[PDB]
Amino acid sequence: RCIQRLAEMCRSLRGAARLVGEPVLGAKMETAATLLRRDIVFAASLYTQ
Amino acid sequence: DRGVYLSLLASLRTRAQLPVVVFTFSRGRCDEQASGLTSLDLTTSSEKSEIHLFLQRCLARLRGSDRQLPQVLHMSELLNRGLGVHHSGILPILKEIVE
Amino acid sequence: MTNQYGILFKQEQAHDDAIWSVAWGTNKKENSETVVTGSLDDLVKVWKWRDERLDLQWSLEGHQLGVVSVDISHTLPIAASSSLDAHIRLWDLENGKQIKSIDAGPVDAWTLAFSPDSQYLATGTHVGKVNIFGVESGKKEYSLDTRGKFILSIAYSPDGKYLASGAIDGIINIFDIATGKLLHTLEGHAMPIRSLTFSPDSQLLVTASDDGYIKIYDVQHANLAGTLSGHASWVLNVAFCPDDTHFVSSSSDKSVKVWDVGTRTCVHTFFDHQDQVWGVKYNGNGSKIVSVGDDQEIHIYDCPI
Amino acid sequence: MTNQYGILFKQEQAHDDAIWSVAWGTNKKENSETVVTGSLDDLVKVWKWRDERLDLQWSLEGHQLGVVSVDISHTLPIAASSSLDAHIRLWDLENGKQIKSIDAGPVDAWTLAFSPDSQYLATGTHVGKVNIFGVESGKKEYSLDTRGKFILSIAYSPDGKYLASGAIDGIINIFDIATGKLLHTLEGHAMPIRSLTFSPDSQLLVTASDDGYIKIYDVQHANLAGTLSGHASWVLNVAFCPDDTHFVSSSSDKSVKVWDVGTRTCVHTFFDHQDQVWGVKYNGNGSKIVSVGDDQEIHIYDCPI
Amino acid sequence: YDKAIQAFKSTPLEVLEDIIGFALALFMKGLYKESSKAYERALSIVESEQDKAHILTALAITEYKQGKTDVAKTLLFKCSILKEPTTESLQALCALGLAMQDATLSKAALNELLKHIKHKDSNYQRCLLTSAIYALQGRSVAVQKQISKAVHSNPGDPALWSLLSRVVAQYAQRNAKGGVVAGNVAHILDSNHGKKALLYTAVNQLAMGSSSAEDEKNTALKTIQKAALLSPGDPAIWAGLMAACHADDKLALVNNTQPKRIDLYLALLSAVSASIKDEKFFENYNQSLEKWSLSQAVTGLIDTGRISEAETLCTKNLKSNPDQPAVILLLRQVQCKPLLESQKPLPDAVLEELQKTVMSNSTSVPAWQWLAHVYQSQGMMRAAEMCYRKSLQLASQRGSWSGKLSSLLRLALLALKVCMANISNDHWPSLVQEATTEALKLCFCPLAVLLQALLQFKRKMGARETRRLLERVVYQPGYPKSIASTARWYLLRHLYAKDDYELIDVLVNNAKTHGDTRALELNQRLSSQ
Amino acid sequence: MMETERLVLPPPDPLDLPLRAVELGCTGHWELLNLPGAPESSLPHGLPPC
RNA sequence: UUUUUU
């Protein structure tokens, strides 16, 4: 639950660093997000599919 | 508490009031008595087959290492007999199968 | 903010060795959904995605060495395959039996591509030309010529009138099928290309070279609209979605990415394969992706519209 | 009368080319003192320390490229040798008869070390795994692995439940043999290791570096309790003695220095071995020292207790 | 280059950059004297002595091209006399030394390079120069040892592993298995070294033979195909493919299941030639590759059975150029295949012609072995022996090793076959003895020991020594199936000669614990005579 | 070249086996085929120059 | 010692 609640905040910071004008935080938060969601932590819910 | 639950389930199986939802108030006790109950086997053979087919079809999407680790195996063992636990400290993929 | 992507089915061991190419065809007017795959064998197995799973239908085979390219047709039930065997034998897909066999060596064919109307079956040669054979009508009416090197990738625009060809060493050539005259030659990348694709309505040509970049050119001029760099090794295929908004790329770093051309960014990455991924395709109304890999497996994903 | 460390022997041409691994086994309490060496000529030779000298017992073979590591077992008379083609042999050491030949794939094994009761024969791997092959009965009993680079040197704790593994990047991983759960990772250096040695009553761990420094660590923590700065060029091998008092080191600058933990100074330095030294070892007590260099000479020094 | 020269013309050539560029363009086109003049002119106006050393090295290279190695050498020494060498003058000096077949200065240059230069970070070029120096002296085993040393120092570096595999394929191809492992390691440790590493591991697998567990997915054919998919540009992959197809056919024939992959030789030859045409220059290597590919294609076509295509291919090649004594032998071979396939006697005129043609191209053990086979076919045994002897003498002088063993074993087979016929002039056993002793002197050839067993059984059939030798051949493991079966079969017949039913059933269980059809069936046939 | 002819009995005994020697690879590895015919080495011209 | 969301 903590990892799921972090990969969803390191993605609204990708949206705010693009708004402030920080293109190096955008390129680091867009990496820290894609390396954080790979496996059973992000398994699709049975109900949804 | 182990004898209390086995005497309750003995008086509960004699009648048809079987699908009983225990409400515990802390997760360690919650998985503790589900581990400690350890012999009911309330399920027939065809229910064994359907439980096994459904759980294998839903669990066989994900990869190798992720499908043999302690909770998955332990919960599958309990579910085989027809028992589940549903506290807040288990993977959502197991809450959804139990539900 | 992205959508819900995910696996639906996983064939465990389709062939006995690496799988080198895949084609998905919604050929029949009804819901057939036939998938044809070729491997480092003689086998050209013909699968069918019926409702929720793939059931093997044909295991047809006549080849001697590994198959390097397979193709399917949208009008007729038919398929074509080429190999290191110097033969282009084209199958039937209905009774599972060979129809023809064309003799052509690594100097006459490397990779296959049918016409939009399933009539011509162009292939790329070694000496630089593109050879256009004739299905059901014999062999080798004419060959387009580009004064270049070994040619790896061949693409046909969906509406006709355009044929594109990548090569070892990078250069890209665009011909028009109407007259057979070279429109213009792009200089592109600096390493082999080995995959190309137009977009539906044919105004956007997407390459994928050996250095990791994905150029997005624009047809009818020489404009390029950007360079997509998000892989970590070679890029081996690019398939463009039925609606002109996304495309899928499989690389030799064991990863299938889904891009969108509006903002030139990667929406979702699939980390499910365990070895090089040699083939990706969409299906009909593009909402599922097939991916054949170096480890013998067939993945089918779910990309909701 | 001071008994100073003396050269006391030289054997001019032990092998035909460079010598790479030396092991000293006092298995028999009687006059056996077996010394075994592997030397890039694909020969593993067994020598014995008879009265004051080395007399060859036998030279035994079967190895494709040069031999990289040899080991002698304390409990039973038995030897083990690995080479560059990742192929492991066990030698009888009573007849020279190759008891067992543990094979291995392209990337399985680099160096070797027995278990204290001579049962497991742990070995490193080009891609980071530390898989263990049960002696004389089993193959690939299990594979204890981390994520990391090439792993040059591997040590086994004397008492047990410890296994320290250096890496080419320069980091140390120590694993408890009970279950395989990494105890703690030491950053180490920024250059490869090439040697790891424990102590009897194993509380101190000594690491050799490729920059010439030697680092002393305490097993209970990551306390970098030491640093020694005498060797000019790389350091290739470090060994202790049956008492926790001092150790020998073998640089790549053609010098063997004997350091002490108590005072952290070089009590003595040896000047032999025209070319660089690749191995050093101590016998069943502190008396005698064996050094094998790149030049084809075996040296046996003396160092009173 | 002409456009470049014209462009450099339309400027005042007064700064170092313009003069240097002009010089390189001039050198590229030809015109070495002009480039030398321009480089000297650039040398006049020079600061930053690194550039002075580089200009001196360029001068040495450009005049070397014309010839005049003496002046190039002195100019490179002059460059060395500067305050600090550049690691580029040293490498050029080593290569210049290697271009003249003398290792005196090359060793000195290499030691100089090693001595005080560590900031170079290639680590592959130094190994290549060191190995080339050792190969110059003809050592040919030291080379592999030197590369093994280099790989021991830096176990990373895919390039080093790949080079070790290549060297094992070229020099000392008796560590074929180790080479296969080295190529596999190089391919694993990266992806972009795939191309060369797969080529070299495939060639090593070809050299090895079939020394595996008859496992699929890792045979020579599979690896060469993987390499062909990775890089379809070099001609070596196509030649390797031709060799792999032929070897697979022979292995299937040994296993006796089915020949497969029959007719593609002409297409592969076309691919090889087309691919060579676009390679810049390794002239000797390209010529060698094309010659080997042509010969292999003709032989493959003859074996499969398409004689006519082989004939037309050879004739076209001769129609291209005046005769070269290699291809004419191929034409002779294709000519003389129908005849002697059906029994026929050949006339001394044709036979003498063939012998004369073989002397044309000497220094080739294959040719001599083929001629000896022809003599044996008609039956002129002693002449066959002489031709085989010439092949052995030639092979031993060349330092090759496979040819020596092949010739010796072939001669032993000739003598044993002559003995089989119950011929008088009891001298063929003596020839068998000498050939087999030499064969065992080289190695541990199972065929040689079975051949001795057959000689012993045939000559002085006897009771004990023959059975002992045969049983030793058939009972210790590590022997091929076919050889074990033949020794077993003769031992069964002889063991039946000296009746012991117990021992015969022991032989039966030995057959049972393996797979056989013929020994036990013959035993069934001869249990009730 | 001394005899110029040899006459031999080709089916000397029908029980025994003719010896067919097939050569596999450059490192010595031979095998025995059953049916009679030519020697049939593998890679007759040697290894391809790589 | 229970429970939770942008």
Residue numbers in the entry:
A (entry chain A): 1198 to 1246
B (entry chain A): 550 to 648
C (entry chain C), D (entry chain D): 1 to 305
E (entry chain B): 1036 to 1564
F (entry chain A): 1 to 50
Lines from the paper:
For the structural analysis, we incubated wild-type recombinant hSKI with a 25-uracil (25U) RNA substrate and the nonhydrolyzable nucleotide analog ADP-BeF (which mimics a prehydrolytic ATP state). Cryo-EM data showed that essentially all particles were in the closed-state conformation, resulting in a 3D reconstruction of RNA-bound hSKI at a global resolution of 3.1 Å. The cryo-EM reconstruction revealed well-defined density for six ribonucleotides (N1–N6) bound in hSKI2cat in a single-stranded conformation. hSKI2cat has the characteristic domain organization of DExH helicases: a pair of RecA domains (RecA1 and RecA2) contain the ATPase catalytic site and are juxtaposed to a helical domain, resulting in an overall globular shape with a central channel (Ozgur et al., 2015). The 5′ nucleotide (N1) binds at the top surface of hSKI2cat, where it engages in base-stacking interactions with the so-called melting hairpin of RecA2. The ribonucleotide chain then binds along the RNA-binding surface of RecA2 and continues into the helicase channel, threading between the RecA1 domain and the helical domain (at the so-called ratchet helix) (Büttner et al., 2007). However, the cryo-EM density of hSKI revealed an additional and unexpected feature: the most 3′ end ribonucleotide interacts with the wedge segment of the hSKI2N domain. In particular, a Trp-Gly motif (W146-G147) in the hSKI2N wedge segment contacts the 3′ hydroxyl group of the N6 ribonucleotide enclosed in the helicase channel. The interactions suggest the presence of a crosstalk between the hSKI2N wedge loop in the gatekeeping module and the 3′ end of an RNA substrate while in the hSKI2cat core, rationalizing the presence of a single class of particles/states during 3D refinement of the RNA-bound data set as compared with the different subsets of closed and open states in the apo hSKI reconstructions. In this closed conformation, the wedge segment in the gate binds and occludes the exit of the helicase channel, enclosing the 3′ end of a bound RNA substrate.
